[PDB]
């Protein structure tokens, strides 16, 4: 029942020969505009334009002052004032860098996270609210307009180990987080407490006060489970009101909090139930930090493995067996595929590998 077909049009290696962990297409650019994506790995942040006939044009290369730094994630946004594109990067050093993609010059660096940062996500509605998951067991929500730490998610009922991923729902009402503690927790940010916290962070101004901004400390999630996976949870994304998550278990599980017919906004924080709806089976992805992704309209699901194969599913198919598309393979792609990014229109698919290579796959 899957329709989708791709073509490997191009591949290149970055001369640093260090693993590429993250890849992201800038989905903020408008129609007709160039299709730009960023790659992160080592102390490097490289930008690329996608052109006709599988041409991948190198634009700029940010090389971090810190040689020890190893970037793991990157998130695209824009300046709410100027409409100027903005890119946020983070890694091992646990420092969030806000880069001007046009000058490839850092504009601000947020510190606070006690350890490494594994994920970065911009709220789907507000371009200033940056979420970061950390090795320090907590989630930090930041206002990048007023340079404030809005909230710290964690504590008494937060993750008991390194948080590995997180995802906002389409509307930006809530976050689903996951980590080495095998759990998946839900944080509602549309609570009278959170919305007020966000509002307060916008009214905060240093040239009006001597006293610093007080972050909210959210010790209690609105849902928790360890009934989904038997090892670390390395990737989590929402599929509407449903969750898609994975472990080393060679499957992406589609589940939901509570009993099969319980509405997500009606489940109580003390809910013990969970409903496993389906599995996306694949192979040779028994290692950690392998991140699956989707296209804007959430019709496609891509995942890479340790041997350079690229699994794709058609999410519009109900049974996840018949949803399977042709595994994208290339006898020259044998390194582990850390992450993939579709272009906003789905015409391009990029994969990043451990051997410092980028692989381009154009839809037919």
């Amino acid at each position: 029942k899957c329709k989708y077909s791709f073509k490997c049009v191009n591949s290149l290696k970055e001369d640093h020969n260090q693993p590429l962990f993250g890849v992201q297409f800038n989905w903020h650019s408008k129609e007709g505009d160039p299709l730009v994506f960023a790659t992160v790995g080592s102390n490097r942040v490289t930008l690329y334009e996608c052109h006709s006939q599988g041409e991948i044009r190198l634009l700029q290369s940010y090389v971090d002052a810190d040689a020890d730094e190893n970037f793991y994630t990157c998130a695209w946004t824009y300046d709410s004032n100027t409409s100027h594109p903005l890119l946020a990067v983070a890694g091992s050093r646990g420092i969030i860098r806000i880069i001007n993609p046009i000058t490839m010059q850092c504009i601000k660096h947020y510190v606070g996270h006690g350890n490494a940062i594994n994920e970065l996500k911009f709220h789907p509605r507000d371009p200033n609210l940056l979420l970061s998951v950390s090795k320090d067991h907590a989630l930090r929500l930041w206002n990048i307009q007023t340079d404030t730490l809005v909230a710290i998610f964690g504590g008494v009922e937060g993750h008991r180990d390194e948080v590995l991923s997180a995802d906002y729902d389409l509307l930006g009402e809530k976050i689903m987080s996951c980590g080495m503690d095998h759990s998946l927790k839900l944080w509602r940010i549309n609570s009278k407490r959170m919305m007020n916290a966000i509002k307060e962070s916008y009214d905060y101004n240093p040239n009006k006060t001597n006293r610093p901004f007080i972050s909210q400390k959210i010790h209690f999630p609105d849902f928790s489970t360890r009934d989904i996976h038997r090892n670390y949870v390395d990737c989590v994304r929402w599929l509407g009101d449903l969750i898609l998550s994975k472990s080393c278990e060679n499957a992406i599980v589609c589940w939901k909090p509570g009993k099969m017919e319980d509405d997500i906004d009606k489940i109580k924080p003390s809910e013990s139930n969970v409903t496993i709806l389906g599995r996306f089976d694949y192979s040779q992805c028994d290692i950690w930090y392998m991140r699956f992704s989707m296209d804007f309209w959430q019709k496609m699901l891509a995942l890479g493995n340790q041997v350079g194969k690229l699994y794709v599913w058609d999410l519009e198919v109900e049974d996840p067996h018949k949803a399977k598309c042709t595994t994208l393979t290339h006898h020259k792609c044998g390194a582990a595929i850390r992450q993939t990014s579709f272009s906003r229109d789905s015409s391009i698919l990029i994969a990043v590998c451990d051997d410092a290579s980028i692989w381009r796959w154009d839809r037919l």
Partner: peptide, 29 residues
Amino acid sequence: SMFSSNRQKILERTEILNQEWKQRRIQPV
């Protein structure tokens, strides 16, 4: 069905996000 109802939520919502994107001009890099 469960699936059909969830796919519609995806449509309605992603359209809200798309309509927000269309009403916006972001500078090329």
